[PDB]
């Protein structure tokens, strides 16, 4: 090469360079090979490989390649190995002349892999990119000016769980809560086996009674108003109905209603019937 | 180091022991 | 190596230190004379050329009663004449006086002693501080010491097992003032703050330990049990070993959000114990009980940021995983949508050593939890309402201002901890695209 | 050494951890750094009874036992003696378990040092 | 915009003089990677760091730092310059066809024990007129002293070695010329200087083989430091004693006897 | 052909400890370092994992890494801890705190030079290095970050060698670290980039194995890590012992990696029998194949039914003949052609080695480049998005020094990896 020098767009630093060195003329004669008759490599060609200095640039790598080729007869083939697995070829057009040094191809081990990659990976990358856009500041502060719902409001904290009604008995001080045995719907992660550390409580055994509960003809699954005692709860200005999980669970206690936002995130399930407009009593 | 005569009741016998290292 | 220097500031800190150091001595086989009649002690006890073991502790107090009680107590030969810093006059339950008037005349020599322990500690992991922010010295001098330690030792771990004012019955009336100001001072200058209010300890002792008359001794015994459970990972061999800084990242999601809850299990008495087979699943369930938490805050009243479970004894990782799976199967407790993992686990082989005369029946296995949850903001909101009711009327402002404190510092504390409130709100908020 | 509990070779399910309990779960500090790099990994009578039997004693420092002995050597190129006896004093410090020998002559014109 | 820094090496504005003569300078007035395609065609980066020395790979391309034997040291402050600035030197330059030194008094009757060491100390100067005054005064005192130079031989050793140790080629050449003039001043000068070979000859050893079909058309200045060193060695042997050769051989190993 | 091993973090350190005790048992090496075996074959290739000293001890070619010296102390307190060389113990002052940033950039970087020094000393001590082994966890701080840094700086120092990683991947339902997705992404985009073959362990698959296959009542980390030790012994059994059809580590790599980015494998061991059911087993080649390809026996939490086998390898040990192994490996492919990708025939390599594990008539280790690795990658990436949208726990990394662009490109690389697993799973001829 004289002035064909191009700077690669990639930032992979050169790593080493291999010379397919070819033995001397007398060596070829005493092996029985004619040096004048030289896609398959010559039988006597041997891959003698040399290394590049730490943090060498492309100019240094090409200078080292030229220094390796400086031998009048030995080198015929040079492979400049970069840091990304690629190798730039530096073949000799004519093995018996010095000046005919030229690059031919730059093969990469990931060549065809990326060639068939950049049809589906780009689509998935484009889909995933807007999900990675940060939704908050460095601290918890969300960027947008749109107000978030009251997070500690009961109608936001207890959308799908019965509220923790507090009882003084059992305590001599402020009540805290009592844990509930209630289970989540069976939502196994996709693509994993039924791997269990120990005998577990099967979720199908504890399917809610409000599943295919007959709605009678009233249009309400509930019968008596003990639904207010056990199923239906009031959350400030909102009314919660816990029987709404019957439409979300499968006959095997599997969550079938998985509402995904258009971006791809999951919208948390809710079981609020509506806003009970409680007001001061008036005459 | 040489191998001894092929012993069939040992988890450390080779296929080549079973074949020809009989002696 | 692996030293954890203990600091006990104020009366609550000093008594908790007495209890936990008794526990550590009985766990490591160290008598009050300091001689082992047999090197896991090296984390808490520094060796001497005469073979005795001096605790790596500093009992700092502004009034001499508790330190004099220590000097006349059982462990007088154990404890150094230094590392036992005594003031001449009390802080008078005033954060301003503990931080601005008497704090300077004692913090210089307190830091000198801290350096005299730190240079000895060749593998120091962090500082475990014990104080009550509700008092005067434990609040003011505690905050001053935390600031000085942060500016001196840099990014060293700082676990403040701090006792916070109770929701409904308080020792004092200026206690909300001291709490708000102390929290203002520590939000930046402490690493991990641990809730240690007395209501939940009293409630657990009365309900599970069958103690009709709980007291500070039982409270400090439970606190020492929890401290030993958290610190035994680097003291004894275990299946999963975790250091002081290991749960730092696993438990603090945001720099302001470091206040965390505690719960111990099994908190069981001798009579209760032989009726119960304390399996890993059972002890984990008792941990995740809202009642079992050592704080008068309901974890069911909010989301869970991240939980850390320190198992001790003959626990097996198989049963630990089974317990984690069966506790996530529960709907009554729910995590934030942005922490699907939300769990850290560390298993230590050493079972908890029972203290003679103690109320805890020893068990083959016991698990503690240190957990960050959004529901911890209840105590902050309540203490803020208290501080607001008093500060609107300007009650007890003259004491603090005459104690060398700016009048605007109350306002700054209120604003910044209100920012903490809203931070808790909006980190408990779910992830919706409208936020972006 | 070789017993029933050690008979089983190491197979995925043939190892019993609870059989081999370490005596102490305390984790001995083999590995230590000396704060300047340098990574490193690593008198017969008991003092209790010797102090119990001597109530007035507090420490064994500077409390050696004074003994008197002699060592004899053959002298071949002398003029008057053929077998010489040299006298020594023994100091046996009990605190250190240490022995010291000091040469002490008898007559003024000993010729020894 | 930017700034221009012209090359000033070997020019009129060369700062080498300033940075080698600290006391002087003033006037007369004070990314991807192969993750599954490992092959025998690549190696690791060579370890050419100095710490790699005496290891499995060896030094590689890590040369040791130079000892700075040829490095040009800073000239020590000179009592001759201090005394001239004070006003104690009875010398002044006279300008004409060739610059010369004019004396207050006859050189013959001056106290050489005072004046000769000062002039010999002044040879290290790199700024005129101090250099010219010192060297011309040395030459005048040597050629007009007679037998008064012999007792001052012990006192002249410190200035000579101090000037030689500077590693300045010009200073070394000037000291060599002055040493030749001193040797050819009396019969016993070389005899007295034989014991002092161990403090003068090391610099001559260092600069013995330093020179700077084509002739050197300019050599009247006699700037060849190696040639001057050789000439001084031959002159020392000629006007020395029996032990002169053995002392010179002990100092410089590559020297050859000019009388045996 | 020498193997030099490194173990980082506590996870990797106890796993490597058990691996070394297993190798010592196989070669008849007692804890004191001498040889008390019962055959000459244990000396033929004892140099692969051990070096004889001037005390007669067979010191392992093992390098231990931990910012926490506590695990170093635990292993030296272990039964076989005296085997390791004292100077190979590299440790620091403060632990990583489960922080990839601390393990990779500040605390690990200060000790990476010393660990490179000792590893290089072991390298030139070895006659011909066949390659490097690594054991660590992707969810830890100094196991993941420091291990990835080690492999990155050894790619640029021994690129022609084979560097394996038996990394222990995390799991959401086995969550025992809340920054597992961060550490896993940061370590996967380095392993896919610098690990020539990186085969993974999920502790829940091991729990399943010890639950219904082994049926152990109380299996601690000892019995837990014994499976990983067994598979590590199996992948180099053909190296350490003669075989009817032997192979080596780079044989496995070249026959299991079709494209440079597709090198994340699953593992499997056989036979494994519950305590009290040996009388029902047959212990034959067919049974070994069945337990090999059984879904529950796989020691990585993935469902091969939902994926396709790019390439599998079966390393048999014991006195068996080649016809039945070939017939079984053909029959499984023929009967499960829906689970073997059609654009490559006979996806299963079979290697036969003389020596079965001590006490076992015959055994086999399984390596599988199934496309079902994509579900674990997708799960970890989904958790990573879940935390990254709110940038939870990101302040630790950002204040420790790394920037957000590295995190974003890390997940970009991992998403490309899972996308290409899907692409080749769905590829047609
Ligand atoms: N857990 C626990 N808390 C205690 C104990 N003793 C005192 N406290 C707490 O301390 C508060 C009372 O104030 P002080 O103990 O005097 O706090 P102080 O700042 O250390 O001392 P002062 O400045 O004099 O108030 C109470 O609200 C308790 O919560 C104890 O033994 N255990
Ligand atoms: N199989 C096995 N896994 C372990 C062991 N110790 C830790 N782990 C796993 O390693 C992960 C955490 O790694 P960690 O301890 O933080 O790594 P480190 O910080 O670098 O020491 C957990 O998910 C555990 O499942 C062990 O002894 N055996
Ligand atoms: Mg007090």
Author numbering:
A (entry chain 2G): 1 to 38, 44 to 288
B (entry chain 3a): 16 to 38
C (entry chain ME): 1 to 38, 47 to 444
D (entry chain 1Q): 5 to 46, 65 to 135
E (entry chain XO): 3 to 32, 74 to 255, 261 to 308
F (entry chain MF): 2 to 430
Paper's wording?
The movement and pathogenicity of trypanosomatid species, the causative agents of trypanosomiasis and leishmaniasis, are dependent on a flagellum containing an axoneme of dynein-bound doublet microtubules (DMTs). The beating movement of flagella is determined by the axoneme, an intraflagellar cylindrical arrangement of dynein-bound doublet microtubules (DMTs) that run the length of the flagellum. Here, we present cryo-EM structures of DMTs from two trypanosomatid species, Leishmania tarentolae and Crithidia fasciculata, at resolutions up to 2.7 Å. The structures revealed 27 trypanosomatid-specific microtubule inner proteins, a specialized dynein-docking complex, and the presence of paralogous proteins that enable higher-order periodicities or proximal-distal patterning.
Given the high degree of structural similarity, we focused our analysis on the L. tarentolae DMT. We also identified 27 MIPs not observed in previous DMT structures that we named DMIPs (doublet microtubule inner proteins). The four paralogous RIB72 proteins (designated A-D) bind with a A-A-A-B-C-D pattern within a 48-nm section of the A tubule with a paralog every 8 nm, whereas the two paralogs of CFAP106 bind with a A-A-B pattern with a paralog every 16 nm. A defining feature of trypanosomatid DMTs are repetitive densities that stretch across the B-tubule lumens termed ponticuli, from the Latin for “little bridges”. The ability of the ponticulus heterotrimer to recognize three different sites of the B tubule is determined by the association of DMIP4/5 with DMIP15, a 48-nm B-tubule fMIP that occupies the five adjacent interprotofilament clefts between protofilaments B01 and B06. Our structures demonstrate that trypanosomatids possess a five-subunit ODA-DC.
